[PDB]
Amino acid sequence: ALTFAKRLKADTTAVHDSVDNLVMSVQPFVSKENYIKFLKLQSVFHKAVDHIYKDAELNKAIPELEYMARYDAVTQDLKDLGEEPYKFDKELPYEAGNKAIGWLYCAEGSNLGAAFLFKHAQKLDYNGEHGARHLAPHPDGRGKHWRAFVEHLNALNLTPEAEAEAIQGAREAFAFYKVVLRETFGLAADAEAPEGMMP
């Protein structure tokens, strides 16, 4: 692939689809109880990247980055559902450097692709003002926002060597998402969606 952002996508599409499949297999919308499990999982992931969204160096390369964070929104969704802020039971990742750029790609891309989840949350009467605030589209549009973000990512002009570390970071962010999902939904370590399932 000819660009950093495209290489990130290429190298992480298989694991991304494993995440999509696993999230859907545990039935996040089957009940309020399961949706709360989903919100807990989302809380941990978005907390884990909070310090990256606020990173001073990255905010100088990517204007207004700190404001793209969704942790506050997920935490308000929890409140809406009658829950207090959720705290992970285990130590949370606090990644840095090139690898942290990969975590940032993973988190920011998750908003890009949150339309399907937002659609299904709406069936439960949860919308951008109550219960599904964290899934609502960027006010400028999901795509407009992502393409801009994508420009800034490519413009970091990471050397190929630093790109490798960033891509490894993205692999690790996806893997952590599934570790959290499993602990949260009561699955075994390394549990996956039924084999052969397609997003």
Q: H helices of the chain, where?
A: 4-25, 32-48, 50-53, 56-61, 71-80, 97-112, 115-122, 142-155, 160-185
DSSP three-state, residue 23? helix
- Applying CB under 6 A, does 100 fall inside the site for ligand HEM? no
- Applying CB under 6 A, does 24 fall inside the site for ligand HEM? yes
Please list every residue from 138 through 157 that binds ligand HEM, using CB under 6 A.
Answer: 143
Output 56 or 140, the one with its CB closest to ligand HEM. Answer: 140
CB 124 to ligand HEM: min, Å: 15
**CA-based angle 164:21:133, to the nearest 5?**
85
- Applying CB under 6 A, does 98 fall inside the site for ligand HEM? no
CB 113 to ligand HEM: min, Å: 2
Whole-number Cα distances in Å, 194 to 83, 86, 168, 191 = 31, 29, 25, 9
- Applying CB under 6 A, does 93 fall inside the site for ligand HEM? no
- Applying CB under 6 A, does 134 fall inside the site for ligand HEM? no
| Residue among 4, 11, 15, 23 that touches ligand HEM (CB under 6 A) | 23
Output 53 or 82, the one with its CB closest to ligand HEM. Answer: 53
Q: Spell out, one character per residue from 162 to 191, where the chain touches ligand HEM: x when CB under 6 A holds, - when not.
A: ------------x--x--------------
CB 34 to ligand HEM: min, Å: 13
Please name the residues in contact with 92: beta carbons below 8 A apart, sequence gap of 6 or more: 44, 47, 48
- Applying CB under 6 A, does 106 fall inside the site for ligand HEM? yes
Annotated binding site for heme b: 9, 16, 105
DSSP three-state, residue 146? helix
Please name the residues in contact with 1: beta carbons below 8 A apart, sequence gap of 6 or more: 7, 9, 10
For 132, other C-beta atoms within 10 Å of its C-beta total 25
Interface residues with ligand HEM (CB under 6 A) are: 9, 16, 19-20, 23-24, 105-106, 109-110, 112-113, 116-117, 143, 174, 177, 199
